[PDB]
Design a protein around this ligand. Structure first.
Ligand code: HEC
Ligand code: HEM
Ligand code: HEM
Ligand code: FES
Lengths: 416, 72, 244, 122, 364, 85, 383, 50, 39, 132
């Protein structure tokens, strides 16, 4: 349900009587993708400063996504309207709050987060993969900025960022839970007061096949990731890309089902225990995406074997995927979509992301209908178009001596 | 007349080939003088103009070679 | 050694068949074979050439066959054991004028005129040498040199004394195509024919060479391009070292 | 191969005597500049023949920072040789940065080996 | 609802049209059997039934798109399933054949269970906070709720023990089927016609629940490499679950990850009120560098006490939010959050990591 | 040995080094082939010339002296010196 | 695992061709090895097609060769290959030794490899010489005669070994037949030696133009250095075609086309070009036993080289004086090769004696002295 | 993560699927030229058997 | 495979190109062009 | 080793009488080239006068020649086979043409790079006939 208030801001809510808890949040787009190297991380810092305000009993948290930012005030159902007002206040006084703020403490917090994403091997690998894939464009920048750039941010920078991006045309109030939509809309309208402005032009980005290798021989595993130019939220292949990713699905060697998971790659890598774990994903940004896998290999001598087998299984995508695999992938993608949309916090984040970045959100039933329309031939056409023989972007962290340089993995993308 | 003899005649008259022809002819004269003495048969070193002849013929060949087969 | 011992170095005449893409002047091969049979067959064998080798090179098969019948060859003796002889055929090799080296040495003051089927690949100057040898005789030997009896002076011959003596003289042969028979023309023709006899694969060899160069040069350029292309990722690597 | 013990013995034999020092040391710097390894980012001790148990021990006993810097310099030298290009004068290794960092560890390794050999023949 | 076995069934509509079916074996958790049996049992749940093997049931489930897991909790053994609304008749039946006639073959005990259980234990204990929490439960509830949550080789378990613990448990009175987004009547029918109908009403020779016997004033120290962690544990009666949920949310709780709370002002600090059927444990933990944790735990202790009753009352709504977040399908929660003051003087203490740096309980 | 397989090549513990590269199909092949093959080749030849030229000059000077002496010996003026040797 | 690793045969092919972790900084010189292997194939390949037509009888050897040239369909091509390809085999082998001498590929971790190298060299020379004797031209016959006469200088067994070599009392039918048999054979012994060479290479890997360890940055071989091998192979084949098809007899000697006649020695006796240097050394020493010993030392002293090279730094790429010494040695080796074909004359006897003196002095004086001097200079300069 | 080196000059001007198609063209041309050369050589050698 | 067949395309192309250029560069020298004069 | 077929022909034969007082007639002997000559009166005398001590080689003409005027020499001019040239060298007797070394009328390694005297081919002679 949608209602465009005065100021032109849109309130989008997905109310469900069965919701355990309610959530309402203001999101104003312009994540890291809107920043540049010198002032990178300013969006995350501003959102953290706003989210650090008095919560009046609610749970105020920052979002800090790649392309959009926002503050979400989780709260029980009956309190939702209050939370509404809260965030409205927090955003009608955003410039005042930033001005009166001593950014020191918030900057050590953001630097701690930036170090965290540079220590968690998967976070580091995926951040490096995104940076190298879209190198040269703002989309390459970290969501939370780097430790070198965070410390160089000042209040005036955050004020300029808010003035540019915290405008009615670039902001959305998303909500979910069990409440009357009209009550929340009325409560926010009386309290929301933000500057006028045009929606900032979203910066361009183009995929560039590349390889980045942070080899740290002191780590205990090899955390690699390989991906191709995926499908953005706008592309009609979005769900088709998710189905293609789920065809290969996840795998954890020590999990009980490791010996029974359907995907062929799982059966292949367990013969010599090539890999410890992997997960296929289709990350989707506003207009471009990254479709691939992340993997952790325990045996440093089998990174090449895993890459070879995974890329061969990708080659299967354009030739030999059976109706069984396509049906399994469809069912698993539908279940994953429904799982991702259970928590009211997740529903609010999803509503904000879609409404800001594509303008319209497909209901879950519409998404199910769109996925069920996929046939095996559609998946193979997508594999031919986007996976078969397309440039790949690679990343690795530790014990990657066995990760053969680009040309080997790239040539694996087209050998039968 | 065959082209080769006329080419040799033209080349030996060239300025580059002139000094070699000169040296060769006074070598011939000197060797004939050496042959005039009655003691020639006893001389251990009986001179000959082989070297001057070779120099002359090399300097004439270097001229005739590139042009001859244009005549045939 | 002395310049005389090594023999005057023959110059480089621009033969029609020197360049990488020129064949023998098969007109010259035929004329050279004529000069051979007319002059050189008196002394020189040229055994390794069979009449069949001439078909399609300097003589049509009918001419080679006819030239074969004009000679006699030893056949398997009759069933009665008596010697028998047959007219020559294409498969037969050209016969030399002497039955054995002993006869050749006897008939040439002890000098042995070498078989000419390899004389071009068995001499330093190759074709040029032969030419320079046949027209290198000076009317007057250089003053002072004394030749052993029976030897004639030729500067291009190692040692300066050759038992041959000039053979090619003006208008000694009436060419079949009306070409003038100057001594230089005859020498060029004989040298070309002997070069063919020593290198019958010359034309085929150079044609195959042209095809091989085309293929291998295109393939080498392709390999250069492919290697540079597949090495662009490595030559474009950029490192960073950022310790604390 | 010549041991760093013997190389240093000869070098200190020369350096102690002023005449030989004055004659050689300018020639030593000139030779090391013309060697051309500094233009590829390598310090002298990077050139040392690693494939020996003594030298392998010496590297295996390097500090962390020196080990990583050596790794990066060797990788940079490999890349420069690979791409047939040299470091500009400003980025090359200056004479004062060629600090003979690995020599002490090699000397310690050779001291240990020489004591072991001497005591085995006590 | 119930069936003649006395198997309770609860069903209620769900927001995201997934039938998040779940079975809660009431007292087959880590408290019941000898230390670690429940972990191995949970690892045996979905492998080989009397109806479908692991490689068949898992493949069919993945085709159907559903997910299934078996998590061990100190109170109950939870078998969670999650599938599209069309898929209920399959999974429910499977779950029946999981509780009844699970094969427990030795080759699974040696290839899929012990290796997996050991890997999970090692992975969990690598986290100093979780090791500290396990030790805190051990020293606060000496038996029952203090049993290690995961299998440890220090207490060897043989297949016969796990099999005999599946039997003599899993009884009708001992299992509670809970679903979200499935009609209660249809679920009742499917359960009645499934294998759940064949379970005995009660275990004949086991399930003699013991009293809680909460102990306080204790302490422990568990040396560990890498990150350190200091934890403080208050045992709490069930009727006090309301007081401490308000206290935790007042200072900062793991369920509500947010800055601006007093406990979030110090690095690595958090709090959480673990809630069980007959007792609970309020844990204030700090983790990270040993030197940092040394002061962090003292600051957290000083924060938990000396919390203004006005701010405690303000935290009532946040505590209600936290309770609503925690009340998943598997772990139903019914706690009335009151602002009543909650004492801390009765705390147990556990230190993990650089024991030369971490303080002793006498330093709080 | 001093060179293991890919997993363990014997390289010391390597760390902090990040290697960036771009794919082929996305890089200009023969980017500077024409200009480099001239300028950089000339630079390399300039650096390495003396090492090949000084030995070459010495050896070819010796060879030229020997060749000229041998040619001089076998002439009507070199007969006497040839006899004396 | 991939089929290229699971199967033992494909596992070997992978270890040597597809995943051999070659260093990333190797020049084109490291391709020479492949060429040598390629040439070993060609020598064998064309070789096997010449024995199908070559008749080893002394009265048929030369006529049989001419039958190959004139009568066999592509016989001219096969012979010109088998000959100019041997010449190119030795060109590539001399380049492979020059590379191993310039860069310290003979130093510690690869000394064993180097040894097989030398043996290969020695063996190859035999093969080549023996094969040349099969043509039984003038130069062929008289080269065999001179070789056996020189080997007749062994102190006591010399008078008895030569008849065992000749198989008679002079180079005759038995000699040519045994040379043909051993020449057909020894190439396969050389293939085995090349396999041993590759094993000794694989144990410790290949060196670098920089000399420093390559382990820090090593590349696979299938997309890298196989396509560099193709450049080197196609350049090799292009030059090999420029020789085989155009002027194929340039490297040979014309006198070899005159059938062997023991009763007339040709004006000069020279080996085929690639053996000229050692031949020169043989003539530099007056004593026949001295000459043969000095020659075989000229070949074997490569074994002493890894121990006389007292250099702490592998290779010459970063060494001033050693590069000058190396190029001086190379040019003296070319000078020895040149003197090999020149008559023993007034200046050339002394020049060849001096050239041999310096050739051995290189290994036994210059390499150790220069290496020690440069070690000291390096240490003094850095301090 | 960080700022990548600028490859602008190194980037090709040609289409994404087009340059690989041209690479296929020349690699296949090399393969088939090599096949033709091998055919010629093998035919020439086997013709000696005749 | 298609390698075998494709090799024929290139081999024939180069063979015909060379066997058409050669008898044009050398037409004045080959036998088949000179035989008329001596017949 | 020598097939028995080759050892047969170890002794050859020769018609000594035909050769002139001043001529050299090479023949093949012991399956090898041999230089066969009949000594000229002046040459035979010149050799008798020549001192063996003067030559570095320790050989004498009297031991070298079995029958006085008719003597046998092996063809190789030098210790390592050198095709023998005629009437050249230190004494003007033979030239080791393979190296241009000098072979004396004695056949000894007179000058050049020569090592030993040209082996008198071990031989016996009958009347105007020879064996070798
Ligand atoms: C009559 C006898 C002839 C005739 C008609 C020709 N030649 Fe020549 N030949 C002859 C003799 C006596 C010799 C002895 C050579 C010597 O004294 O060394 C030769 C030799 C040659 C050679 C050898 C040249 C060399 O070895 O350097 C060649 C070549 C040669 N003969 C060729 C040749 C040609 C092309 C003729 C054309 C008519 C020719 N000969 C005629 C005796 C005779
Ligand atoms: C590295 C190994 C080899 C090398 C370097 C080599 C080299 C040579 C050379 C230089 C010649 C001289 C030919 C000439 O001058 O005309 C020759 C002759 C010959 N070789 Fe090889 N060869 C090798 C292996 C082989 C093999 C394996 C064979 C198997 C048959 C072989 C067969 C022959 C034959 C038959 C000849 C006689 C030449 C002829 O009849 O034209 N060779 N070899
Ligand atoms: C048929 C002959 C030979 C073949 C096929 C062969 C094979 C190879 C190969 C494949 C390589 C790796 C590529 C390279 O380093 O160039 C190599 C390197 C080498 N070659 Fe050979 N080899 C041959 C003969 C020789 C000889 C005769 C010598 C020395 C006398 C020699 C010395 C070496 C050395 C020392 C190396 C190691 C180079 C390094 O690691 O830097 N090789 N060889
Ligand atoms: S000629 Fe007698 S030694 Fe060579």
């Amino acid at each position: 349900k949608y209602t465009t208030l005065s100021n032109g801001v849109t309130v989008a809510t997905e109310t469900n009587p069965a919701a355990k808890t309610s959530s309402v949040g203001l999101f104003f787009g312009a994540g890291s993708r809107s920043e540049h190297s010198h002032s990178n991380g300013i969006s995350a810092l501003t959102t953290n400063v706003l989210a650090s305000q008095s919560a009046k009993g609610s749970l105020l948290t920052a979002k800090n996504d790649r392309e959009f930012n926002g503050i979400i005030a989780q709260t029980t159902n009956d309190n939702i309207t209050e939370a509404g007002k809260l965030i409205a206040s927090i955003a009608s006084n955003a410039v005042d709050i930033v001005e009166k703020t001593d950014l020191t403490k918030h900057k050590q917090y953001l630097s701690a987060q930036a170090s965290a994403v540079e220590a968690d091997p998967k976070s580091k690998v995926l951040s490096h993969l995104y940076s190298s894939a879209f190198q040269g464009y703002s989309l390459a920048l970290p969501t939370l900025g780097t430790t070198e750039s965070v410390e160089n941010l000042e209040n005036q920078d955050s004020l300029r960022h808010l003035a540019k991006h915290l405008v009615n045309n670039n902001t959305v109030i998303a909500a979910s839970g069990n409440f009357d939509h009209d009550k929340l809309a009325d409560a926010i309208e009386a309290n929301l007061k933000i500057a006028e402005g045009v929606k900032p032009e979203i910066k361009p980005a183009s995929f560039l096949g590349s390889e980045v290798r942070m080899r740290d021989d002191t780590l205990p595993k090899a955390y690699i990731s390989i991906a191709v130019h995926g499908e953005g939220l706008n592309s009609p292949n979005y769900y088709l890309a998710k189905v293609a990713a789920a065809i290969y699905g996840d795998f954890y060697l020590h999990s009980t089902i490791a010996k029974f998971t359907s995907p062929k790659l799982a059966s292949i890598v367990q013969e010599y225990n090539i890999v410890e774990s992997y997960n296929h994903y289709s990350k989707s940004f506003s207009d471009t995406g990254i479709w691939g896998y992340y993997a952790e290999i325990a045996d440093k001598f089998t990174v090449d074997d895993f890459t070879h087998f995974s890329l061969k299984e990708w080659n299967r995508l354009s030739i030999s995927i059976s109706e069984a695999e396509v049906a399994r992938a469809k069912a698993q993608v539908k279940t994953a979509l429904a799982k991702e949309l259970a928590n009211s916090f997740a529903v609010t984040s999803d509503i904000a992301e879609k409404v800001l970045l594509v303008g319209h959100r497909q209901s879950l039933r519409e998404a199910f209908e769109k996925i069920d329309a996929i046939k095996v031939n559609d998946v193979k056409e997508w594999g031919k178009s986007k996976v078969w023989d397309r440039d790949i972007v690679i990343s690795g962290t530790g014990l990657i001596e066995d990760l053969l340089d680009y040309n080997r993995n790239r040539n694996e993308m087209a050998m039968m | 007349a065959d082209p080769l003899d006329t080419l040799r005649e033209e080349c030996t008259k060239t300025a580059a080939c002139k000094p070699f022809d000169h040296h060769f002819h006074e070598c011939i004269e000197r060797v004939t003088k050496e042959q005039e003495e009655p003691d020639y048969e006893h001389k251990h070193y009986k001179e000959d103009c082989i070297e001057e002849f070779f120099h002359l013929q090399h300097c004439v060949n270097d001229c005739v070679a590139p042009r001859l087969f244009n005549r045939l | 050694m002395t310049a005389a011992e090594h023999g005057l170095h023959p110059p480089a005449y621009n033969w029609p068949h020197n360049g990488m893409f020129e064949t023998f002047d098969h007109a010259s091969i035929r004329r050279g074979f004529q000069v051979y049979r007319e002059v050189c067959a008196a002394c020189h064998s040229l055994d390794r050439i069979a009449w069949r080798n001439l078909v399609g090179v300097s003589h049509t098969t009918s001419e080679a066959k006819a030239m074969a019948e004009e000679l006699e060859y030893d056949d398997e003796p009759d069933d009665e054991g008596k010697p028998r002889k047959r007219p020559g055929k294409l498969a037969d090799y050209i016969p030399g004028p002497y039955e054995n080296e002993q006869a050749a040495r006897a008939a040439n003051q002890g000098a042995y005129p070498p078989d000419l089927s390899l004389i071009v690949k068995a001499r330093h100057g190759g074709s040029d040498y032969i030419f320079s040898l046949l027209t290198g005789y000076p009317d007057e030997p250089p003053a002072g040199v004394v030749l052993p009896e029976g030897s004639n002076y030729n500067p291009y011959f190692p040692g300066g004394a050759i038992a041959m003596g000039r053979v090619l003289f003006d208008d000694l042969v009436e060419y079949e195509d009306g070409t003038p028979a100057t001594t230089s023309q005859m020498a060029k023709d004989v040298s070309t024919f002997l070069n063919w006899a020593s290198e019958p694969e010359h034309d085929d060899r150079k044609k195959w060479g042209l095809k091989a160069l085309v293929v291998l040069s295109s393939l080498y350029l392709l390999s250069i391009w492919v290697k540079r292309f597949k090495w662009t990722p490595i030559k474009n690597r950029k490192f960073r070292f950022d310790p604390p | 191969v010549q041991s760093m013990t013997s190389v240093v013995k000869a070098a200190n034999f020369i350096l102690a005597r002023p005449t030989l020092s004055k004659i050689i040391t300018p020639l030593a710097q000139k030779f090391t500049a013309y060697a051309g390894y500094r233009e590829m980012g390598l310090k002298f001790n990077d050139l040392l023949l690693e494939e020996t148990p003594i030298m392998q021990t010496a590297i295996k006993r390097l500090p962390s920072e020196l080990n990583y810097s050596r790794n990066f310099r060797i990788l940079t030298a490999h890349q420069l040789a690979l791409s047939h290009q040299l470091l500009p004068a400003e980025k090359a290794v200056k004479p004062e940065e060629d600090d003979n960092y690995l020599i002490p560890y090699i000397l310690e390794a050779e001291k240990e080996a020489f004591e072991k050999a001497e005591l085995d023949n006590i | 609802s119930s069936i003649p076995n006395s198997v309770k069934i609860a069903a209620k509509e769900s927001a995201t049209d997934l039938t998040k079916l779940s079975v809660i074996i009431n007292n087959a958790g880590s408290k019941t059997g000898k230390s670690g049996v429940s972990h191995l049992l949970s690892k045996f749940t979905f492998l080989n039934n009397g109806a479908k093997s692991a490689l068949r049931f898992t493949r069919e489930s993945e085709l159907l798109g559903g997910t299934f897991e078996s998590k061990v909790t100190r109170d109950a053994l939870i078998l969670n399933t999650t599938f599209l609304k069309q898929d209920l008749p399959y999974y429910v039946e499977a779950l029946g054949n999981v509780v009844s006639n699970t094969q427990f073959a030795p080759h699974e005990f040696n290839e899929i269970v012990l290796p997996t259980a050991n890997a999970e234990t090692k992975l969990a204990n690598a986290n100093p906070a979780f090791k500290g929490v396990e030790k805190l439960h051990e020293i606060t509830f000496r038996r029952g709720l203090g049993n290690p949550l995961f299998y440890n080789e220090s207490t060897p378990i043989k297949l016969e023990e796990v099999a005999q613990f599946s039997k003599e448990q899993f009884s009708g009175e001992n299992i509670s089927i809970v679903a979200e987004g499935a009609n209660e009547e249809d679920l009742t029918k499917f359960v009645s016609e499934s294998a759940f109908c064949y379970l005995p009403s009660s275990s004949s020779n086991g399930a003699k629940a013991l009293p809680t016997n909460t102990f306080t004033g204790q302490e422990a120290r568990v040396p560990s490499s890498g990150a350190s962690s200091a934890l403080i544990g208050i045992p709490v009666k069930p009727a006090d679950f309301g007081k401490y949920e308000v206290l935790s949310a007042a200072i900062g709780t793991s369920t509500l990850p947010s800055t601006s709370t007093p406990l979030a002002q110090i690095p690595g600090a958090t709090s959480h009120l673990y809630k069980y059927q007959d007792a609970g444990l309020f844990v204030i933990s700090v983790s990270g560098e040993a030197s940092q944790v040394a002061q962090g735990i003292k600051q957290a202790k000083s924060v938990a006490e000396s919390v203004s009753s006005s701010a405690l009352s303000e935290a009532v709504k946040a505590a209600e939010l936290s309770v609503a977040l925690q009340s998943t399908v598997d772990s139903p929660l019914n706690v009335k959050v009151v602002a009543e003051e909650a004492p801390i003087s009765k705390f147990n203490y556990v230190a993990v990591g650089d024991l030369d740096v971490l303080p002793y309980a006498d330093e709080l | 040995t001093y060179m293991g397989w890919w997993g363990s090549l014997g390289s010391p513990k390597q760390k902090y080094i990040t290697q960036y590269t771009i794919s082929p199909y996305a890089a200009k092949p023969l980017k500077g082939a024409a200009y480099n093959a001239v300028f950089n080749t000339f630079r390399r030849t300039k650096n390495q010339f003396l090492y090949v030229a000084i030995p070459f000059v010495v050896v070819w000077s010796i060879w030229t002296r020997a060749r000229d002496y041998n040619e001089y010996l076998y002439t009507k003026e070199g007969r006497e010196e040839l006899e004396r040797v | 695992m991939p089929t290229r690793k699971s199967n033992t045969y494909l596992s070997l092919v992978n270890s040597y061709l597809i995943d051999s972790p070659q260093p990333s900084s190797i020049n084109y010189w490291w391709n020479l090895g492949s060429l040598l292997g390629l040439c070993l194939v060609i020598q064998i390949a064309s070789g096997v097609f010449l024995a199908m037509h070559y008749s080893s009888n002394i009265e048929l050897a030369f006529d049989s060769v001419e039958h190959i040239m004139r009568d066999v369909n592509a016989g001219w091509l096969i012979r010109y290959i088998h000959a100019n390809g041997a010449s190119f085999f030795f060109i590539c082998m001399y380049l492979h030794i020059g590379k191993a001498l310039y860069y310290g590929s003979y130093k510690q971790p690869r000394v064993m490899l180097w040894v097989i190298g030398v043996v290969i060299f020695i063996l190859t020379m035999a093969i080549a010489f023996m094969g040349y004797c099969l043509v039984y031209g003038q130069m062929s016959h008289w080269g065999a005669t001179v070789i056996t006469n020189l080997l007749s200088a062994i102190p006591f067994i010399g008078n008895d070994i030569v008849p065992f070599i000749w198989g008679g009392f002079s180079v005759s039918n038995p000699t040519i037949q045994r040379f043909f048999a051993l020449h057909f054979l020894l190439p396969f012994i050389l293939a085995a030696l090349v396999c041993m060479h590759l094993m000794a290479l694989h144990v410790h890997g290949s060196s670098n133009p920089v000399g420093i360890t390559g382990n820090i940055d090593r590349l696979p071989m299938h997309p890298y250095f196989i396509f560099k091998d193709l450049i080197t192979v196609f350049v090799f084949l292009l030059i090999f075609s420029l020789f085989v098809f155009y002027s194929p007899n340039t490297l040979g000697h014309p006198d070899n086309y005159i059938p062997g006649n023991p009763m007339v020695t040709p004006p000069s006796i020279v080996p085929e070009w690639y053996l000229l240097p050692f031949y020169a050394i043989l003539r530099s020493i007056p004593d026949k036993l001295g000459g043969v010993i000095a020659m075989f030392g000229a070949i074997l002293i490569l074994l002493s080289l890894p121990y006389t090279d007292r250099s702490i730094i592998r290779g010459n790429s970063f060494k001033v004086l050693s590069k000058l010494a190396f190029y001086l040695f190379v040019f003296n080796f070319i000078l020895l090769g040149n003197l090999g074909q020149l008559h023993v004359e007034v200046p050339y006897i002394q020049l060849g004696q001096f050239a041999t003196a310096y050739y051995f002095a290189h290994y036994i004086i210059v390499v150790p002295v220069i290496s020690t001097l440069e070690n000291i200079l390096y240490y003094i300069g850095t301090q | 993560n960080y700022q990548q080196p600028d490859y602008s000059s190194y980037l090709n001007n040609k289409s994404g699927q087009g340059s690989r198609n041209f690479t296929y063209f020349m690699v296949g041309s090399m393969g088939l030229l090599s096949a033709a050369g091998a055919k010629s050589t093998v035919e020439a050698f086997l013709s000696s058997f005749a | 495979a298609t390698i075998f067949g494709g090799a024929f395309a290139f081999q024939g192309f180069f063979d015909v190109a060379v066997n058409k250029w050669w008898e044009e560069h050398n037409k004045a020298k080959l036998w088949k062009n000179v035989k008329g004069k001596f017949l």
